[PDB]
Design a protein around this ligand. Structure first.
Ligand SMILES: Nc1nc2c(ncn2[C@@H]2O[C@H](COP(=O)(O)OP(=O)(O)NP(=O)(O)O)[C@@H](O)[C@H]2O)c(=O)[nH]1
Ligand SMILES: N[C@@H](Cc1ccccc1)C(=O)O
Ligand SMILES: [Mg+2]
Ligand SMILES: [Mg+2]
Ligand SMILES: [Mg+2]
Ligand SMILES: [Mg+2]
Ligand SMILES: [Mg+2]
Ligand SMILES: [Mg+2]
Ligand SMILES: [Mg+2]
Ligand SMILES: [Mg+2]
Ligand SMILES: [Mg+2]
Ligand SMILES: [Mg+2]
Ligand SMILES: [Mg+2]
Ligand SMILES: [Mg+2]
Ligand SMILES: [Mg+2]
Ligand SMILES: [Mg+2]
Ligand SMILES: [Mg+2]
Ligand SMILES: [Mg+2]
Ligand SMILES: [Mg+2]
Ligand SMILES: [Mg+2]
Ligand SMILES: [Mg+2]
Ligand SMILES: [Mg+2]
Ligand SMILES: [Mg+2]
Ligand SMILES: [Mg+2]
Ligand SMILES: [Mg+2]
Ligand SMILES: [Mg+2]
Ligand SMILES: [Mg+2]
Ligand SMILES: [Mg+2]
Ligand SMILES: [Mg+2]
Ligand SMILES: [Mg+2]
Ligand SMILES: [Mg+2]
Ligand SMILES: [Mg+2]
Ligand SMILES: [Mg+2]
Ligand SMILES: [Mg+2]
Ligand SMILES: [Mg+2]
Ligand SMILES: [Mg+2]
Ligand SMILES: [Mg+2]
Ligand SMILES: [Mg+2]
Ligand SMILES: [Mg+2]
Ligand SMILES: [Mg+2]
Ligand SMILES: [Mg+2]
Ligand SMILES: [Mg+2]
Ligand SMILES: [Mg+2]
Ligand SMILES: [Mg+2]
Ligand SMILES: [Mg+2]
Ligand SMILES: [Mg+2]
Ligand SMILES: [Mg+2]
Ligand SMILES: [Mg+2]
Length: 393
RNA sequence: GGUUUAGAACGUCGUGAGACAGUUCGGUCCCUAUCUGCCGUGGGCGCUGGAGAACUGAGGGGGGCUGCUCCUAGUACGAGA
C-alpha cells in the first residue's frame, strides 16, 4: 500500500487447474522466477504461494493464492487453485473469476479423476479457454511414453466439449526452471508466449452499473475490513456509495481505497481482481458470498422461478427421479446455498436429463436478477445447470 | 517393612482366664571357612643333555543391543489423505 498501480497493458485473470500433487502450485512458482529474471519484474518465491501450518506439515494447498507476473503485451493475475476433492467449494470461487485456465496433466501419471472433475466445473461455471502443461517430463527419459499422455488429454477435452486438438500442449519441468537450467527456463518462457497467443483480449462490461462478488474478506490492521474479488461489471471510484447485498440482510457502506496487489488505484475497472476497503464494517458481520452493488440496482431474494436443466449419466449428474422436498446446493457467483424445490402442477416427477422450470425457496437470501446463471451440485458432484426466470421473495 | 514370642489398646466372642490370616503402636537376625565349588595368585616335579628366546594352535572364554534424523522419494502404492 504505497506505489500507485499504472493502468497499462490489458488485465487477464489466469489460474492453474489439475489433479492433486501434479505440479499445479509449483508451476506458479516457476512462472515467477522465470519471468522476473529475464524481463526484470518483481522476484517473489515458492514458499509465499503457500505457507501456514496447513500447507507445510501436510504440503497440500487449500486457499486460492494469487500472483502478479508482468510481460510486454499483458499484465497477468494468477489464481492458484487447491486441486483436491475436499476443496471444490473455495476452488469454484477461484475458477469463476479466472478467464483462461492453465490445465496441469503430468507425463508419468496422466489424466486422473480430479482432472475430469475440475474441467467439468470449468465448463458449467465459466472457463472460456484452457492450456495444458506437462509438469514432469524429465523423470521418464523416453519419447514414446511421454507423447502417449498428450493423446489422452486431447481426448479428455474433446470428449467433455472443448477444442482438444487445437489447444497448445506444452512440456516442461517446474523444478528445473526454479534453479537455472537454460533449456527449461526457455520452455516456460514459451508458455508465457502460448498465454499471449491462444487466449485473446477478454471482453469486459464497463457500462452497466457496479457489481462485485466477495471471494474473501480481510481485516487489515490499521485501515479496516477489506473485500477482494473480480469486478463483474461497472467501475469503483474512491469515496462512492456502495450497498452490500446477500446473506443475513443488507448494509450501507462507502469505499475508502481500491487496490491491485498491494498497490493503489483510482478507478477499479471491470474484469480484474481488486481489494475494496469498506468503511465502518466489522470482520464478522460481513461474510463471504455477499456482493458489493451500487444502491438500488439489486435486491436480496429468498424465492424465485428458474429454468433448471437437470443432467443425465452421460453428461454427469443424477440417475434417479425426485419429488418436492429435495435439497441440493445452488452455486451462484461465488458461494453455495441449500433450497427446497417446489415443482409446477401437472408434473409428477423430475427425470434425469430434462428441461423444466421450478420454484426454489432458499434458506439464505442471495442477491440475484432475471438472467443469472447458476450450477446445482450435491453429494460431491454436479447435478444441473440453469437460469433465473422470475423474482418473487 | 510383613508373618509368627513376651507389653499395650480397639472392635468382636467368652461369666472369666483369655481368644480372633480382624485391626492397631513397640519389639536382640550369631558363626575367624576344614572339604566341595568359584576368582585370583604361586611352589613342586614332568615334558628324557641342559639353558634362553620366539611362535604354532587342540581347547576355552569375550563380544553380538539398538534409536531416530536425513538420502533413496513425497518415489512405488493410493480417488484423496
Ligand atoms: N520430478 C519432478 N517433480 C515435480 C515437477 N513439478 C512438480 N514436481 C513435484 O510434484 C509435487 C507436487 O507439489 P505441488 O505442485 O505443490 O502440488 P499441486 O500440483 O499444487 N496439487 P495440490 O496443491 O492439490 O496438493 C512436489 O513434490 C513437486 O516437487 C517436475 O517437473 N519434475
Ligand atoms: N486482488 C488481490 C488478490 C488477493 C486476494 C487474497 C489474497 C492475496 C491476493 C491482490 O492482492
Ligand atoms: Mg503421485
Ligand atoms: Mg496446489
Ligand atoms: Mg500428499
Ligand atoms: Mg501414481
Ligand atoms: Mg494410476
Ligand atoms: Mg471507519
Ligand atoms: Mg516378631
Ligand atoms: Mg504380638
Ligand atoms: Mg517368652
Ligand atoms: Mg459361656
Ligand atoms: Mg493367630
Ligand atoms: Mg495366620
Ligand atoms: Mg478390621
Ligand atoms: Mg482395614
Ligand atoms: Mg508397624
Ligand atoms: Mg521402640
Ligand atoms: Mg508391629
Ligand atoms: Mg522381634
Ligand atoms: Mg535393634
Ligand atoms: Mg547375618
Ligand atoms: Mg577373625
Ligand atoms: Mg566372628
Ligand atoms: Mg576348592
Ligand atoms: Mg576355580
Ligand atoms: Mg583362576
Ligand atoms: Mg594364573
Ligand atoms: Mg599352578
Ligand atoms: Mg606352575
Ligand atoms: Mg623340572
Ligand atoms: Mg610322568
Ligand atoms: Mg627335567
Ligand atoms: Mg615348557
Ligand atoms: Mg613322550
Ligand atoms: Mg617328545
Ligand atoms: Mg633336551
Ligand atoms: Mg645337542
Ligand atoms: Mg628343565
Ligand atoms: Mg627349552
Ligand atoms: Mg603365541
Ligand atoms: Mg609366546
Ligand atoms: Mg582342559
Ligand atoms: Mg580355536
Ligand atoms: Mg570362539
Ligand atoms: Mg560365548
Ligand atoms: Mg540401530
Ligand atoms: Mg519425503
Amino acid at each position: 500500500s504505497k506505489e500507485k498501480f499504472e493502468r497499462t497493458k490489458p488485465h487477464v485473470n489466469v489460474g492453474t487447474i489439475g489433479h492433486v500433487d501434479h505440479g499445479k502450485t509449483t508451476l506458479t512458482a516457476a512462472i515467477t522466477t522465470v519471468l522476473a529474471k529475464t524481463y526484470g519484474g518483481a522476484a517473489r518465491a515458492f514458499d509465499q504461494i503457500d505457507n501456514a501450518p496447513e500447507e507445510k506439515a501436510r504440503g497440500i494447498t487449500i486457499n486460492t493464492s494469487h500472483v502478479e507476473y508482468d510481460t510486454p503485451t499483458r499484465h497477468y493475475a494468477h489464481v492458484d487453485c487447491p486441486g483436491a476433492a475436499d476443496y471444490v467449494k473455495n476452488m469454484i470461487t477461484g475458477a469463476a473469476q479466472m478467464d483462461g485456465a492453465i490445465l496441469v496433466v503430468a507425463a508419468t501419471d496422466g489424466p486422473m479423476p480430479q482432472t475430469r472433475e475440475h474441467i467439468l466445473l470449468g465448463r458449467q461455471v465459466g472457463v472460456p479457454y484452457i492450456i495444458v502443461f506437462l509438469n514432469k517430463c524429465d523423470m521418464v527419459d523416453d519419447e514414446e511414453l511421454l507423447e502417449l499422455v498428450e493423446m489422452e488429454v486431447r481426448e479428455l477435452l474433446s470428449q467433455y466439449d472443448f477444442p482438444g486438438d487445437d489447444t497448445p500442449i506444452v512440456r516442461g519441468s517446474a523444478l528445473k526452471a526454479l534453479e537455472g537450467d537454460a533449456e527449461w527456463e526457455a520452455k516456460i518462457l514459451e508458455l508465457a508466449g502460448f498465454l499471449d497467443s491462444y487466449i485473446p483480449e477478454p471482453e469486459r462490461a464497463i457500462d452497466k452499473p457496479f457489481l462485485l462478488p466477495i471471494e474473501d474478506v480481510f481485516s487489515i490492521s490499521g485501515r479496516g475490513t477489506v473485500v477482494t474479488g473480480r469486478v463483474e461489471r461497472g467501475i469503483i471510484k474512491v469515496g462512492e456509495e456502495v450497498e452490500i447485498v446477500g446473506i443475513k440482510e443488507t448494509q450501507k457502506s462507502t469505499c475508502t481505497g481500491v487496490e491491485m496487489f498491494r498497490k493503489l488505484l483510482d478507478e477499479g475497472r471491470a474484469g480484474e481482481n481488486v481489494g475494496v476497503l469498506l468503511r465502518g464494517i466489522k470482520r464478522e458481520e460481513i461474510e463471504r458470498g455477499q456482493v458489493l452493488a451500487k444502491p438500488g440496482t439489486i435486491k436480496p431474494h429468498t424465492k424465485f422461478e428458474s429454468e433448471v436443466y437437470i443432467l443425465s449419466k452421460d453428461e454427469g449428474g443424477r440417475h434417479t427421479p425426485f419429488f418436492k422436498g429435495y435439497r441440493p446446493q445452488f452455486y451462484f457467483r461465488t458461494t453455495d446455498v441449500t433450497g427446497t424445490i417446489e415443482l409446477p402442477e401437472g408434473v409428477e416427477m423430475v427425470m434425469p436429463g430434462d428441461n423444466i422450470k421450478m420454484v426454489v425457496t432458499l434458506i439464505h437470501p442471495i442477491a440475484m436478477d432475471d438472467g443469472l446463471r447458476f450450477a446445482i451440485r450435491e453429494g460431491g458432484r454436479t447435478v444441473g445447470a440453469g437460469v433465473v426466470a422470475k423474482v418473487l421473495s
